[PDB]
Amino acid sequence: NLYFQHMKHGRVFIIKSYSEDDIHRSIKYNIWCSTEHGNKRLDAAYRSMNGKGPVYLLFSVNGSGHFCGVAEMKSAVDYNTCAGVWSQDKWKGRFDVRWIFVKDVPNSQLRHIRLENNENKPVTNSRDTQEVPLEKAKQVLKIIASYK
Ligand SMILES: Cc1nc(=O)c(C)n[nH]1
């Protein structure tokens, strides 16, 4: 899948989900919510983008050993929400997402990609809302898209 090899715009973030049930709910309802600090980071990136390129999210459940898919941010963060929707009751907030890949990709396939903005650590050792440089994100996206 040579599609992503020539991407010229966009920002890309890691999402770490404590719960696979929350991944299921995100796919069913096309929504996500991060922590307070994570929501602020994603909101800033989405808003400054002003629709000039995509914001992609690379999802992985904590401790699972694999990534589980890719979604595009499709709205700014709405902070005026009901509590208790997600795996920890305190998280409020919501933004729309569109899932573009739902597939398990082992960390072994992605570990060789290092993030020069994060001490050259493997992309598989990232924390929630770690940003991925575009040239490294393109390599992750090609691998996820091509994996079978
Ligand atoms: C739904 C959800 N799970 C999480 O573990 C985090 C960090 N943010 N949002």
Short mmCIF file of C-alpha atoms and ligand atoms in Angstrom, two decimals:
data_model
loop_
_atom_site.label_atom_id
_atom_site.label_comp_id
_atom_site.label_asym_id
_atom_site.label_seq_id
_atom_site.Cartn_x
_atom_site.Cartn_y
_atom_site.Cartn_z
CA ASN A 1 0.00 0.00 0.00
CA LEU A 2 2.21 2.81 -1.39
CA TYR A 3 -0.53 5.36 -0.69
CA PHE A 4 0.96 6.88 2.45
CA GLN A 5 4.51 7.04 1.04
CA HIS A 6 3.95 10.52 -0.44
CA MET A 7 1.80 12.16 2.24
CA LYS A 8 2.75 15.86 2.45
CA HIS A 9 0.40 17.19 5.16
CA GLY A 10 -1.02 16.00 8.44
CA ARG A 11 -0.20 15.40 12.07
CA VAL A 12 -0.19 11.98 13.74
CA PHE A 13 -0.53 10.99 17.40
CA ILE A 14 -0.31 7.80 19.47
CA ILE A 15 -3.39 6.87 21.52
CA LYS A 16 -2.93 4.44 24.41
CA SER A 17 -6.23 2.95 25.60
CA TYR A 18 -6.41 1.21 28.96
CA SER A 19 -9.43 -0.81 27.75
CA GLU A 20 -10.21 -2.86 24.65
CA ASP A 21 -13.90 -2.40 25.45
CA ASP A 22 -13.34 1.34 24.93
CA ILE A 23 -11.84 0.60 21.49
CA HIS A 24 -15.01 -1.33 20.67
CA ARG A 25 -17.20 1.59 21.81
CA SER A 26 -15.09 4.05 19.81
CA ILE A 27 -15.57 1.98 16.66
CA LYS A 28 -19.31 1.62 17.25
CA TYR A 29 -20.00 5.29 17.94
CA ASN A 30 -17.12 7.00 16.06
CA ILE A 31 -16.02 8.96 19.14
CA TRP A 32 -13.02 9.19 21.45
CA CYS A 33 -11.97 11.03 24.61
CA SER A 34 -8.45 11.37 26.06
CA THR A 35 -7.24 12.70 29.41
CA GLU A 36 -7.50 16.41 30.20
CA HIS A 37 -3.93 17.02 29.02
CA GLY A 38 -4.33 14.69 26.03
CA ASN A 39 -7.57 16.33 24.94
CA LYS A 40 -5.90 19.76 25.07
CA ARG A 41 -3.01 18.58 22.88
CA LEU A 42 -5.27 16.96 20.26
CA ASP A 43 -7.65 19.95 20.25
CA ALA A 44 -4.77 22.37 19.63
CA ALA A 45 -3.46 20.25 16.75
CA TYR A 46 -6.88 19.78 15.16
CA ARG A 47 -7.79 23.47 15.42
CA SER A 48 -4.48 24.82 14.09
CA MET A 49 -4.80 22.39 11.19
CA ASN A 50 -8.02 24.23 10.19
CA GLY A 51 -8.91 21.41 7.83
CA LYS A 52 -5.71 21.79 5.78
CA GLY A 53 -4.67 18.17 6.43
CA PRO A 54 -5.64 15.12 8.50
CA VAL A 55 -5.02 14.41 12.17
CA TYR A 56 -4.46 10.64 12.42
CA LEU A 57 -4.55 8.58 15.62
CA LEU A 58 -2.62 5.31 15.97
CA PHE A 59 -4.36 3.18 18.63
CA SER A 60 -2.84 0.60 21.00
CA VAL A 61 -4.28 -0.98 24.16
CA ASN A 62 -1.90 -0.88 27.13
CA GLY A 63 -0.08 -4.15 27.68
CA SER A 64 -1.60 -5.75 24.59
CA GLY A 65 1.57 -6.04 22.51
CA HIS A 66 0.01 -4.71 19.32
CA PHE A 67 -1.59 -1.72 17.69
CA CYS A 68 -5.30 -2.15 16.94
CA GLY A 69 -6.06 0.44 14.29
CA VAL A 70 -5.98 3.96 12.90
CA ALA A 71 -8.60 6.71 13.03
CA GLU A 72 -8.82 10.27 11.76
CA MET A 73 -9.83 13.11 14.09
CA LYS A 74 -13.07 14.51 12.66
CA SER A 75 -13.94 17.31 15.11
CA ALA A 76 -12.60 19.64 17.76
CA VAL A 77 -12.94 18.56 21.37
CA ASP A 78 -16.31 19.10 23.02
CA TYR A 79 -15.55 19.39 26.72
CA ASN A 80 -19.24 19.71 27.72
CA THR A 81 -20.09 16.05 28.15
CA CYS A 82 -21.50 13.48 30.50
CA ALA A 83 -18.97 11.76 32.73
CA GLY A 84 -18.55 8.01 33.04
CA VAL A 85 -18.66 6.99 29.38
CA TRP A 86 -15.14 5.53 29.34
CA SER A 87 -13.04 3.07 31.34
CA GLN A 88 -12.25 5.67 34.02
CA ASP A 89 -15.35 7.49 35.23
CA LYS A 90 -13.73 10.92 35.59
CA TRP A 91 -12.93 11.45 31.89
CA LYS A 92 -15.25 13.97 30.22
CA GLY A 93 -14.95 15.29 26.70
CA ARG A 94 -15.59 13.93 23.25
CA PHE A 95 -14.49 14.33 19.67
CA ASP A 96 -15.53 12.55 16.50
CA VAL A 97 -13.31 10.01 14.76
CA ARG A 98 -13.47 8.01 11.56
CA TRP A 99 -11.83 4.61 11.78
CA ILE A 100 -9.81 3.81 8.66
CA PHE A 101 -8.02 0.62 9.81
CA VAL A 102 -9.31 -1.85 12.41
CA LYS A 103 -6.64 -4.55 12.56
CA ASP A 104 -4.16 -6.00 15.03
CA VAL A 105 -0.54 -5.26 14.11
CA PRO A 106 2.13 -6.74 16.43
CA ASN A 107 4.58 -4.33 18.01
CA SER A 108 7.34 -6.44 16.44
CA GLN A 109 6.32 -5.01 13.04
CA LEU A 110 6.65 -1.38 14.17
CA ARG A 111 9.42 -1.35 16.81
CA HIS A 112 12.12 -0.43 14.29
CA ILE A 113 10.58 3.03 13.71
CA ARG A 114 12.14 5.52 16.14
CA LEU A 115 10.89 8.99 17.08
CA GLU A 116 13.59 11.67 16.85
CA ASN A 117 11.36 14.02 18.89
CA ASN A 118 11.22 11.45 21.75
CA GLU A 119 14.88 10.53 22.45
CA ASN A 120 14.90 8.21 19.40
CA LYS A 121 12.66 5.79 21.30
CA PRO A 122 10.71 3.14 19.37
CA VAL A 123 7.24 4.26 18.34
CA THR A 124 5.99 1.20 20.28
CA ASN A 125 7.25 2.69 23.57
CA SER A 126 5.12 5.84 23.35
CA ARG A 127 2.75 7.36 25.91
CA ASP A 128 -0.77 8.60 25.19
CA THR A 129 -0.86 11.53 22.68
CA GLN A 130 2.84 11.26 21.85
CA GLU A 131 3.19 13.04 18.50
CA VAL A 132 4.87 11.18 15.61
CA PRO A 133 6.99 13.06 13.04
CA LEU A 134 5.30 12.87 9.66
CA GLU A 135 8.09 10.96 7.93
CA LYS A 136 7.99 8.28 10.65
CA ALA A 137 4.18 8.28 10.70
CA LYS A 138 4.18 7.53 6.97
CA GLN A 139 6.28 4.42 7.67
CA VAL A 140 3.91 3.26 10.41
CA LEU A 141 0.87 3.84 8.21
CA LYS A 142 2.36 1.87 5.30
CA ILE A 143 3.06 -1.08 7.60
CA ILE A 144 -0.39 -1.05 9.23
CA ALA A 145 -2.10 -0.71 5.85
CA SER A 146 -0.11 -3.57 4.30
CA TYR A 147 -0.16 -6.02 7.22
CA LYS A 148 -2.18 -9.22 6.83
C1 LIG B 1 -10.85 6.09 26.55
C2 LIG B 1 -9.43 6.40 27.00
N1 LIG B 1 -8.58 5.39 27.61
C3 LIG B 1 -7.25 5.74 28.02
O1 LIG B 1 -6.58 4.90 28.52
C4 LIG B 1 -6.75 7.14 27.82
C5 LIG B 1 -5.35 7.60 28.23
N2 LIG B 1 -7.60 8.12 27.22
N3 LIG B 1 -8.91 7.75 26.82
#
